[PDB]
Design a protein around this nucleic acid. Structure first.
Ligand SMILES: [K+]
Ligand SMILES: [K+]
Ligand SMILES: [K+]
Ligand SMILES: [K+]
Ligand SMILES: [K+]
Ligand SMILES: [K+]
Ligand SMILES: [K+]
Ligand SMILES: [K+]
Ligand SMILES: [K+]
Ligand SMILES: [K+]
Ligand SMILES: [K+]
Ligand SMILES: [K+]
Ligand SMILES: [K+]
Ligand SMILES: [K+]
Ligand SMILES: [K+]
Ligand SMILES: [K+]
Ligand SMILES: [K+]
Ligand SMILES: [K+]
Ligand SMILES: [K+]
Ligand SMILES: [K+]
Ligand SMILES: [K+]
Ligand SMILES: [K+]
Ligand SMILES: [K+]
Ligand SMILES: [K+]
Ligand SMILES: [K+]
Ligand SMILES: [K+]
Ligand SMILES: [K+]
Ligand SMILES: [K+]
Ligand SMILES: [Mg+2]
Ligand SMILES: [Mg+2]
Ligand SMILES: [Mg+2]
Ligand SMILES: [Mg+2]
Ligand SMILES: [Mg+2]
Ligand SMILES: [Mg+2]
Ligand SMILES: [Mg+2]
Ligand SMILES: [Mg+2]
Ligand SMILES: [Mg+2]
Ligand SMILES: [Mg+2]
Ligand SMILES: [Mg+2]
Ligand SMILES: [Mg+2]
Ligand SMILES: [Mg+2]
Ligand SMILES: [Mg+2]
Ligand SMILES: [Mg+2]
Ligand SMILES: [Mg+2]
Ligand SMILES: [Mg+2]
Ligand SMILES: [Mg+2]
Ligand SMILES: [Mg+2]
Ligand SMILES: [Mg+2]
Ligand SMILES: [Mg+2]
Ligand SMILES: [Mg+2]
Ligand SMILES: [Mg+2]
Ligand SMILES: [Mg+2]
Ligand SMILES: [Mg+2]
Ligand SMILES: [Mg+2]
Ligand SMILES: [Mg+2]
Ligand SMILES: [Mg+2]
Ligand SMILES: [Mg+2]
Ligand SMILES: [Mg+2]
Ligand SMILES: [Mg+2]
Ligand SMILES: [Mg+2]
Ligand SMILES: [Mg+2]
Ligand SMILES: [Mg+2]
Ligand SMILES: [Mg+2]
Ligand SMILES: [Mg+2]
Ligand SMILES: [Mg+2]
Ligand SMILES: [Mg+2]
Ligand SMILES: [Mg+2]
Ligand SMILES: [Mg+2]
Ligand SMILES: [Mg+2]
Ligand SMILES: [Mg+2]
Lengths: 205, 146, 118, 64
RNA sequence: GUAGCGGCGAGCGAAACGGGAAGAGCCCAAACCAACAAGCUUGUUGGGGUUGUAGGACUCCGAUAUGGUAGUCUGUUAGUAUAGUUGAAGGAUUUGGAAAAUUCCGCUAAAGAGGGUGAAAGCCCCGUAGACGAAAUGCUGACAACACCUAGGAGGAUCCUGAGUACGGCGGAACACGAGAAAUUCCGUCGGAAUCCGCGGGGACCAUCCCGCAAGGCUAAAUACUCCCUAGUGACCGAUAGUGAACCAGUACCGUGAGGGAAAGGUGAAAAGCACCCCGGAAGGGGAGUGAAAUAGAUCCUGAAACCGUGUGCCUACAACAAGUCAAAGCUCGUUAAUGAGUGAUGGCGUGCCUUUUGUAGAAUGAACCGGCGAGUUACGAUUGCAUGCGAGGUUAAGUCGAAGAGACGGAGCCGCAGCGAAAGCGAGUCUGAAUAGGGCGAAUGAGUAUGUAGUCGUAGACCCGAAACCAUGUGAUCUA
RNA sequence: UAUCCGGGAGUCAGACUGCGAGUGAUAAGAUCCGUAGUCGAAAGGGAAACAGCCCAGACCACCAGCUAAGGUCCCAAAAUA
RNA sequence: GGUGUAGUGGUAGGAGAGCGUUCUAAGGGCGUUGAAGGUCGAUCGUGAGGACGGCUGGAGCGCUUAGAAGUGAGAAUGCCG
RNA sequence: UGAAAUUUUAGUACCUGUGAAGAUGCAGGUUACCCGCGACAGGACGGAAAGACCCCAUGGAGCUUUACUGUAGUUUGAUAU
């Protein structure tokens, strides 16, 4: 579609046009949900273990003879019912990550971007240039654009000073156009993207 | 979608059923295993196909046949697929692979006459059925054995 | 992700014990004995909510019989006579009249006897 | 691990187009003097695994 | 989980091709020449040579270069490891013992990671981003130095090219392959070759063809693991958990010995850890003090239940009681204000819970009580349902880049789209059959595939506990023979 | 309601009563079948108590009514009909 | 949402829908003007269960949506106290 | 000064009967004021020991032999030395 283009000073320039194949599709809610769940799961580290009756220290001999003592028959002091005994089943190290069909992945990314554009939470700026990194100046830039909610700042590769000035703000998350994810876009309430970043995004998708 | 309003598609996910968690759940106590017996034990049950000692079906039945070491299987293609090409096109195993019609050619392409051909084509393949060759020739095309 | 016992077990057992309050000794002090007695109490309560209706109808019948005898009639004759006379006053109201409004019960008995004679 | 195939069944049965299993016939080894020529002729023909037997053994031929 | 192996049972189970990570090739023995010594050959040293489109010697020629190294406590240099330095920005207001909390105005951010501070701090402290730093010793990389390898063409007449070896018999073993038709490889025993017109292999064996050249040696990287050290991470545990061990734990304790093997964390912000007085021999209390709090007083945060005790609103000494429930006078009390609460004379009905059973109140089983802990889970596959994407197509695996992420590339490979037959083979048909007959299985009559999720199954301990036992190392004749 | 196709089972110790047989002794709360019911897995009413007999199938509230088997002198509701 | 009809005992067992526990993410909150926890109460829902108030307590914890499970005990002559 | 076995909760009678067929607890009847102390051992199929007898398990172990299959040793021959 067409999105208003703003200059860093905050004054709006002439609109720009975005590819409809990417920013103009009907978002697929279920596909977006699947992508979010898969990404969150992949973030998991999954390092967690317990000691079963074999792994627990000691516990070899039979505590007492099978019959005669009048006590319940036992085989080891480390059986699961014993205090300090092994754990039955329980967590074991494993990976929670899985992969979707490439077409599902692509559709999810396009859906989230198109949702932002449709809701008008996508703000395209002609360029974010800082001679030196200053978080105050980037905060002033956000104020000029009238952004005060969570914002994802998408920058073309090489805009290191913009990234440095923007990253430390609590409401801001900085990502490069080459490295953007469904989770990042969905988490951000607004998406501030430079014109070069939008071009690179369209090329990537 | 918003992370605080996620909603799976209806019927996409179900709740795991946990057994041995009270009687009212319907799987308390015996956990749906019944009362005693081999199948009610941990690790219980007999091996697949076991029949309690009666001679199993495979034991009853005789072995048959052999596998040819020089067996050749041909990737099969029909006139219906051939219709996907234009008149005068040169159909080749490479062409089929690029089009994605035959991803795995196996011993080679054999052409069968299941469909009805309509385009004039010069078809090259390992083998041709008699009906397929006649149909290709009748469609004004030609056939060659690679 | 480990889920220790927590407080749910205590909450459940305390509910049972509060239901068991007033029971004799261990039956209100100890959870296991309390639960068993509370289950039996539930069984008895459900059974008694049906027996209670039987018992009160029985009591009304007895009182109506006494009043009918004093009026010179049996309970069976009185009920048959009331049915003939088209009277639908039930046994609860009949027993209430017998104890409280003797004159009203006597009028009912007179009508029943008249219907029986006819 | 990968589920293993029952090699005896793999040797004795064949998967048909409709998903069924084609099988040989018993009593086709010897002692043919104890069977009428009709029995031998009709046992020469192949057959299909019965529904109950197939439901018992299918998992052993999943990846035949 | 295919080809195969297998009391052809249970089960066991490849390799090549293809796609990737990493990549590297080299030295002798022999012939031949020279030196040395002995006893023309016969041992040592040196030179020479290292192969299958056969190579080398040897004989001619021409070159005395060109490149390389998997060598060195050889130096120089750069970096890095082992201490560190620097590192922005807040005051008041209300509650409070205490401010970081509330309110008001501000300020910093290449630093809003985290930790501590009298409660929850971007701006109080330690830090963090960033910048900077090594006398000394390691380690790494480069540079140089030294060192070591490095030749082309042509002819074969002859010479050399690994012997008790290859191979064979016998007996075993390893190859997925259990002697089977059995290759290939290894061991023991015995027999025992050829050598370039030669030799080995291509799954018995022979012939042809093709591929290779054993009986000598060395060789980095990709791969496996973590006792340790450093910096971190966690939909990992939070004191019956987590290592057996958060605490002076492999300790106490037990055993002759091998060996077995515990319990046990929390005052308070700060000890300010109760001066002094009183009872008492003390212990322990009561005051008085500290403290916001002492019913936080060291058995110290919280302080449940079993169990014990005190006080009392109601009932109880003519009653036969699975202890309750239904009905109910009397008395007592006033709540989440409800057609209330506690107790209860008296009357009706009424043999616990669980397990296992045809059937249990059962005189069958289990529980002394309370509290805590304690049993269908995960991984990889199979299949079905449900859901999503795509659709006669679907889909990537390993691997590279990337934050331990997503994602991108990666089409090798897998499933489906054609079946039939043991097979050759044919093909919307095919097999049987003499048959264009019949019949079987298929097409007409089309949906699959990737992923998620759930049900069930398979391999795994596979829902948890329980044997008598078996096997392999060890410790025991201080008792006893 | 039946088929058929597929996912998931449990069940393979039954008991008694009536009826038809066997074994037994025309015994057994015996044993083995056929048949129907109940219990099993069914509370409620009657048979004093009494899983299998008779009546009858509890989703709940009622201090309402009519009945089944069985009953009406007292325990104990209803006829000293 | 309304009317009508019918149905609603239940072991093995199958199907469906829910309660509660710990943790993760997001959003929105609550807390020395007192969180969790403990205790008492005559409270609400059809059930698992949920609130509210008093007292104790002294620092963390709900709520909505979705996700993951060492997710629910009364019995094992269970283990420890 | 100070335990233990046992212990589902118990306000824990007799007779006859009933019942998983041998009842303190169920039915009918009878008896019995409440709490103890010293004695006895009829019952609680009393406690103690998941019966050793009996049967079962395609359990274990020790032993035997003209069970099967092996095997150490002993012996005989070929062959190498
Ligand atoms: K089941
Ligand atoms: K067969
Ligand atoms: K036969
Ligand atoms: K496989
Ligand atoms: K077998
Ligand atoms: K050389
Ligand atoms: K401070
Ligand atoms: K801080
Ligand atoms: K250095
Ligand atoms: K072999
Ligand atoms: K070769
Ligand atoms: K305190
Ligand atoms: K009291
Ligand atoms: K009573
Ligand atoms: K017994
Ligand atoms: K035919
Ligand atoms: K046919
Ligand atoms: K689909
Ligand atoms: K599936
Ligand atoms: K297991
Ligand atoms: K399982
Ligand atoms: K001795
Ligand atoms: K019968
Ligand atoms: K569990
Ligand atoms: K227990
Ligand atoms: K019994
Ligand atoms: K006695
Ligand atoms: K023995
Ligand atoms: Mg799950
Ligand atoms: Mg059930
Ligand atoms: Mg239970
Ligand atoms: Mg059981
Ligand atoms: Mg059974
Ligand atoms: Mg069973
Ligand atoms: Mg047999
Ligand atoms: Mg618990
Ligand atoms: Mg009634
Ligand atoms: Mg015959
Ligand atoms: Mg600083
Ligand atoms: Mg502030
Ligand atoms: Mg082998
Ligand atoms: Mg040999
Ligand atoms: Mg050979
Ligand atoms: Mg060959
Ligand atoms: Mg060659
Ligand atoms: Mg290596
Ligand atoms: Mg604790
Ligand atoms: Mg511990
Ligand atoms: Mg206190
Ligand atoms: Mg305390
Ligand atoms: Mg008396
Ligand atoms: Mg009295
Ligand atoms: Mg029995
Ligand atoms: Mg006991
Ligand atoms: Mg000695
Ligand atoms: Mg019988
Ligand atoms: Mg049963
Ligand atoms: Mg009944
Ligand atoms: Mg019963
Ligand atoms: Mg009903
Ligand atoms: Mg009537
Ligand atoms: Mg009467
Ligand atoms: Mg908590
Ligand atoms: Mg648990
Ligand atoms: Mg317990
Ligand atoms: Mg009897
Ligand atoms: Mg008796
Ligand atoms: Mg009683
Ligand atoms: Mg005894
Ligand atoms: Mg026994």
């Amino acid at each position: 579609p067409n999105v208003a283009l703003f200059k860093q000073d905050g004054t709006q320039n002439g609109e720009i046009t975005l590819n409809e194949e990417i920013f103009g599709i009907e978002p697929n809610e279920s596909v977006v949900y699947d992508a979010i769940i898969m990404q969150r799961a992949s973030l998991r580290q999954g390092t967690h273990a317990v000691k079963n009756r074999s792994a627990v220290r000691g516990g070899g001999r039979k505590p007492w003879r099978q019959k005669g003592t009048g006590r319940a028959r036992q085989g080891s002091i480390r059986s699961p019912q014993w205090r300090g005994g092994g754990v039955v089943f329980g967590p074991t190290p494993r990976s929670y990550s899985y992969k979707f069909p490439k077409k599902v992945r692509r559709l999810a990314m396009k859906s989230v971007l198109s949702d932002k554009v449709a809701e008008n939470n996508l703000v395209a700026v002609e360029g974010l240039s800082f001679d030196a990194p200053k978080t105050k100046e980037f905060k002033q830039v956000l104020a000029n654009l009238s952004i005060d909610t969570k914002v994802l700042v998408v920058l073309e590769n090489g805009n290191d000073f913009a990234a440095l000035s923007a990253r430390n703000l609590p409401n801001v998350s900085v990502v490069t156009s080459d490295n953007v994810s469904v989770l990042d876009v969905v988490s951000a309430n607004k998406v501030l993207a430079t014109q070069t970043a939008l071009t690179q995004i369209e090329e990537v998708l | 979608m918003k992370l605080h309003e996620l909603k799976p598609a209806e019927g996409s996910r179900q709740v795991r059923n946990r057994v041995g968690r009270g009687t009212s759940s319907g799987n308390g106590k015996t956990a749906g295993r019944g009362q005693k017996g081999q199948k009610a034990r941990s690790g219980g049950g007999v091996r697949l196909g076991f029949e309690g000692g009666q001679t199993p079906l495979f034991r009853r039945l005789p072995k048959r046949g052999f596998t040819n070491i020089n067996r050749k299987d041909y990737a099969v293609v029909n006139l219906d697929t051939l219709n996907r090409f234009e008149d005068g096109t040169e159909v080749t195993p490479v062409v089929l692979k690029e089009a994605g019609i035959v991803k795995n050619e196996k011993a080679g392409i054999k052409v069968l006459a299941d469909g009805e051909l309509t385009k004039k084509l010069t078809v090259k393949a390992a083998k041709f059925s008699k009906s397929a060759q006649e149909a290709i020739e009748a469609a004004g095309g030609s056939i060659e054995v690679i | 992700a480990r889920v220790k016992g927590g407080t749910v077990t205590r909450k459940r057992r305390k509910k049972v014990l509060k239901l068991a309050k007033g029971y004799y000794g261990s039956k209100h002090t100890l959870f296991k004995s309390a639960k068993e007695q509370v289950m039996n109490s539930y069984y008895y309560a459900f059974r008694d909510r049906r027996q209670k209706k039987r018992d009160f109808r029985k009591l009304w019948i007895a009182r109506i019989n006494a009043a009918a005898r004093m009026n010179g009639l049996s309970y069976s004759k009185l009920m048959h006579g009331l049915k003939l006379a088209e009277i639908d006053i039930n046994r609860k109201m009949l027993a209430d009249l017998a104890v409280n409004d003797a004159a009203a019960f006597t009028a009912l008995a007179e009508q029943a006897k008249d219907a029986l004679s006819k | 691990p990968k589920q293993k195939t029952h090699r005896g069944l793999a040797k004795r049965v064949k998967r048909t187009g409709g998903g069924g299993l084609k099988r040989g016939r018993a009593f086709t080894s010897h002692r043919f003097h104890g069977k009428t020529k009709k029995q031998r002729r009709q046992l020469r023909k192949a057959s299909m695994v019965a529904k109950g037997d197939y439901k018992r053994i299918r998992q052993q031929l999943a990846r035949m």
